[PDB]
Paper text:
hBest1 D203A is a patient-derived mutation localized on an intracellular loop adjacent to the aperture. Structural analysis predicted a local alteration by this alanine substitution, as the corresponding residue in KpBest (D179) is involved in a D179–R172 salt bridge formation. Strikingly, the KpBest [name] structure showed a bigger opening at the aperture (radius 1.5 Å) with a slightly twisted I180 possibly caused by disruption of the D179–R172 salt bridge, and conformational changes at all three newly identified neck-controlling residues (P208, Y211, and W252). This suggests a crucial role of this residue (KpBest D179 and hBest1 D203) in the regulation of both the neck and aperture. Notably, the aspartic acid–arginine salt bridge is not present in hBest1 because the residue corresponding to R172 of KpBest1 (R196 in cBest1) is W196 in hBest1. Consistently, hBest1 D203A displayed electrophysiological properties reflecting changes at both gates: first, the [name]+-dependent Cl− current was bigger than that from WT hBest1, indicating a gain-of-function phenotype; second, [name]+-independent leak of Cl−, but not of CH3SO3−, was recorded, suggesting an incomplete closure of the aperture (like hBest1 I205T); third, while the relative permeability of CH3SO3−/Cl− was retained, the trans-promotive effect of CH3SO3− was abolished, indicating dysregulated gating at the neck (like hBest1 3A, Y236A/C, and W287F). Taken together, our results suggest that D203 serves as a communication point of the two gates, while hBest1 D203A is a gain-of-function mutation due to enhanced opening of both the neck and aperture.
Human [name] (hBest1) is a [name]+-activated Cl− channel essential for Cl− transport in retinal pigment epithelium (RPE). Although the structure of hBest1 is still unsolved, two Best1 homolog structures, one from bacteria [name] (KpBest) and the other from chicken (cBest1), have been previously reported. Overall, the channel is a pentameric assembly with a single ion-conducting pathway, which varies in diameter along its length and is constrained at two narrow points: a “neck” contributed by three residues (I62/I66/F70 in KpBest and I76/F80/F84 in hBest1/cBest1) on a transmembrane helix, and an “aperture” formed by a single residue (I180 in KpBest1, I205 in hBest1, and V205 in cBest1) on a cytosolic helix. Here, by electrophysiological and structural analyses, we show that the neck and aperture in hBest1 are both indispensable [name]+-dependent gates, and their dysregulated opening by rationally designed or patient-derived mutations causes [name]+-independent leak and elevates [name]+-dependent channel activity.
Numbering used by the authors:
A (entry chain A): 22 to 288
B (entry chain E): 24 to 289
C (entry chain B): 23 to 288
D (entry chain C): 23 to 290
E (entry chain D): 22 to 289
Write the structure that this text describes.
């Protein structure tokens, strides 16, 4: 959908290349294919590496969200297995854990967490969380308070308390990894130039292809332009994995899966 | 894969016998632009198959950890409570339930017969009532270990060491679920398949000038190696499938069960 | 500074356009086929190199991501288990925060004394800066604070150990950042490939001008822009701790850390 | 084994010369440009394939490394915690060494009887050999020894846990190696992926004569050597536990760790 | 290096080709550049992949050595933090930790450690350390005897004893990874291929260049051979990161940094 526009332009520069062609020698222009085949292969190589980097940002982001689900399930498991009777702490903690993940989606989508927070917590908490530098980080400190007082209440050994504390550390690592990938994107520094280069190549290519491909120029030029531009825009979607493009991650579904898992695990 | 090679032999034969008419419109196909495109395709094909490959390997890793963490959890119980064979058999049957249930979840098949062969039916009923049955099998197993802990037969220190093995099985379950629902992005294989198939049909048309009657044998050779490589990526999706090059999840589940049993004198 | 070299190449082309006609008396012939073998090879090497430069920048960010993660969870641990002991909260947070600023000045080679005096008594600042490894001594002192809690019976040996592991993480960060700063990417990779990228871009028109006559500036400028752009991209990524817009925003990261740790302790 | 295919390349090259005459007698032609597009595609796929093979080799290399690391530090812990318990030192050490040799035999699909019988008493050798997974049973036996030191009260639960971790590392090695052996990720495609390289290297002189009429054999086999080296080297690394020139020296590694452990308990 | 030698011979093959192009028609050799473009690009792809592997193993070697400093630092931190009064064991452990790094240097450089060992430790210990097949291993065992005796004097708990024991496990992983990088290089086929082919390709190339370019052949055939040989010889450096070459890790300075960190941390 994004590239259909500029594919048709390339058909036009192709028609312009075909109409302008017989005049090359009157206009003084000689444009052979060998120099463009060298330039095109070097962009291919560079598009290959940039796409590899983008995808691996995607794969990392997906992996970090996988750990929210893994580590919330097993903190709840350890609670049910060591303090089975305290359904009261069960429910408090699960709300923090469910809050943490919706809070994190908003942080990364850069949207308002007030609604989701009120749906799950008391409004005194909702405002303690909204007041923080980082709500997600505030939610974790709160979830740790819940576990801390069970230790001070003697319901946990220092060993079974260390076991659950380690799961909140796993979520701290998820939080940091998501902020690194969010706020430190792939260097934009050249993404502007990284893309300027690929379309400049696609319009000039028919002008250099016609001499060989007299009337087939618009076909082979559009085929070539398709592949180069598809790869470059996938590279740019996948490179903001928390974005809202169609190939980005489905953070809403993932927060829902997370909610259903913990609620099913406590009630 | 074998069908589209023949359409290529046809295209090349069409190109051969329609070659007379090439300058009628001034349509002319050079090899040069097609070798630029064929090289930009080989690169992207190379990178994609890389991701398909890494995805398949991760799934084999995950399943390998099942065997490892289950072997080592049963090892600890045998080494620490060599007397308590009742707990031995209980914990082994949950650990074997987990693999089978994970397999059935990944293949979206019913785990009921397997679960009943291993567990008492009250336990099966608790598991299948869950919207996440394999995750609940872990809660049960964690319970067996915990009452060994609450009955004083394990110290907090080794209880914690066994709980950690359960956390490893939890990472397998998550990673399988994440892989199952997170394919390599479809946009990748969409444009690879559009681009690879178009390029193979057009190719004999551009080879016919250079190779007069030789195009069918060289154009077919070129398209076989691109389609071989492209279809390798498709052999490495669905690692949890049932196909011949999909993982042998059943045989791996039998190995798991075979190990834990010979480990407890059965 | 890269744009400068573009215009030199435009000149190399117009000189090569006018240098061209006399080529007879010296007998110099330059086809473009050999130059496409060399430009391809350079592009392969430049792509592999940029990959290494990007992976080094990424590891820099991960390192800094870990101080923020490790300092947050150490302070959360303190407030979760000793929520009364705010006299140790303030001392440790001040140590954690000074570790970050000291780490930053260390990587940027600037006087840290302002930040240290702003966060610690002049007794401390005199002591830390007397050491040859100031960031290492801050970790040592932060280790004392937890250790004194360990002897004061306020922490078990277990949770004393758990907080020790967070200082360990910060020890690995200090080491990793030091290792990135002292061990630059093998310089053989930067200027020897900078020279061959440079030589290649100027010598390119003199080999193009045969096939392209007055297009040569237009096409040679395009190619050179491509190579010099990608090569300059690897320039930036590969000194991640530098002071430059594209480089890591260390001052912001340290302010976020300080605001987070204080926000966790009012 | 590959020098045979190189010589067929000089042969094919002589056919190309003495029959090129009659090629256009039919109107059949072979330029270089199509075979240069195809050879570059193959070279790209060879790089990626060799990248995957190599990373299989490095991982098998890291897992064997961990065997030596974990056996050394477990024996170190045993010596440092229980300096007096030499009978226990000796029993565990022979299990550790039995584990390594039995892992080598398991990966190479050879018989471990002689190494087991040199190191352990026959009641345990028949028990180990009876088992479904002998290396796994050796780990279980090593674990019983550490278990009875705990039940006898000679170890804290903590320091008993520090050594039990050492056994878990060896269990991860065992599983990683099992997966790197019976799980070539793709199979009978390497048959395709290398048959492709074989046919390209035979058709190459037919496509080279026109440009370079009798020089083809020297150029045709230079190129063939290049392509077939990279391919066979990929297949060597693909199977790191094999007996090839570029595969793992498991024997040197099993001998190093035996030598380390005897030197570590005062048997050298 | 030895590279500049090989650049000058390319000036000879070119002038040879310049002055022997005369006889090409008479000798019946035709050498289009096109087939050499296909070989060159192939080799460039393989060289690109290989350099990556070389660079990776170099980066890993620097990483391993970086952990020596981290693990030794924090071990000394834990000792002061946990048993601040025991400056006597502080000094013995640190001399072991210092001997470990110097011995690790000698082991990787394959040089005698006796001098550095004599400088740092009593004579009975130097003899014991030099007897072992792996002195770095024996040094870790000795440092661990120190920690162990502090545990059986009741001066450490089982937990804080564990906290410090982990640091020695870390050091063992360092030893193991370094030993692994030192004994397991990139498979030598990777280079013999890339050494024979890159060299052979670099000299046959002007012979193909002369017909297309006649007297420019030297200038351009040299540019190409510099690019390939730079990239390939640089790979060879990065593959022996523990080598005594100029571009290899500066192991002596890292052992000096390590010795000075550890002395600064302990009063001196
Ligand atoms: Zn986890
Ligand atoms: Zn509950
Ligand atoms: Zn494990
Ligand atoms: Zn039993
Ligand atoms: Zn952490
Ligand atoms: Zn406070
Ligand atoms: Zn270890
Ligand atoms: Zn002994
Ligand atoms: Zn460490
Ligand atoms: Zn001291
Ligand atoms: Zn001439």
């Amino acid at each position: 959908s994004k590239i259909i526009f500029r594919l048709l332009l390339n058909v036009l520069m192709s028609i312009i290349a075909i109409i302008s062609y017989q005049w090359y020698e009157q206009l003084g222009i000689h444009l052979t294919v060998a120099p463009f085949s060298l330039l095109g292969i070097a962009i291919a190589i560079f598009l290959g590496f940039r796409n590899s980097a983008s995808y691996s940002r995607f794969v990392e982001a997906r992996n970090l969200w996988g750990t929210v689900l893994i580590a919330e399930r097993t903190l709840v498991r350890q609670l049910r297995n060591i303090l089975p009777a305290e359904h009261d702490a069960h429910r408090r903690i699960v709300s923090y854990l469910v809050a943490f993940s919706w809070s994190l989606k908003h942080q990364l989508r850069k949207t308002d967490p007030t609604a989701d927070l009120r749906r799950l917590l008391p409004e005194e908490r909702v405002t303690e969380i909204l007041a923080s530098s980082m709500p997600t980080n505030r939610i974790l400190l709160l979830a740790g308070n819940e576990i801390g007082q069970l230790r001070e209440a003697g319901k946990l050994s220092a060993i079974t308390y260390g076991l659950m504390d380690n799961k909140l550390d796993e979520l701290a690592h998820v939080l940091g990894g998501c902020e690194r990938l969010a706020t430190t994107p792939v260097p934009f520094a050249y993404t502007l130039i990284l893309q300027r280069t690929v379309y400049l190549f696609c319009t000039l290519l028919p002008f250099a292809l016609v001499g060989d491909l007299h009337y087939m120029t618009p076909f082979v030029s559009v085929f070539i332009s398709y592949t180069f531009l598809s790869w470059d825009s996938l590279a740019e979607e996948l490179e903001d994995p928390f974005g809202t493009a169609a190939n980005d991650l489905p953070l809403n579904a993932m927060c829902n899966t997370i909610e259903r898992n913990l609620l099913d695990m406590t009630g």
